Amino acid sequence: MRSLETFVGDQVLEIVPSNEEQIKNLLQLEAQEHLQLDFWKSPTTPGETAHVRVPFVNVQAVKVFLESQGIAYSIMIEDVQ
**CATH architecture group of domain 1-81:** 2-Layer Sandwich (3.30)
Q: Where are the domains of the chain?
A: 1-81
Which residues sit opposite 50 in a β-bridge?
Answer: 15
Q: How far apart are CA 9 and CA 54, in angstroms?
A: 9
CA terminus-to-terminus distance, the chain: 28
Radius of gyration of the chain (CA): 14
DSSP string spanning 3-72?
Answer: -------EEEEEE---SHHHHHHHHHHHHSTTT---BSS-TTSTTS-EEEEEEGGGHHHHHHHHHHTT--
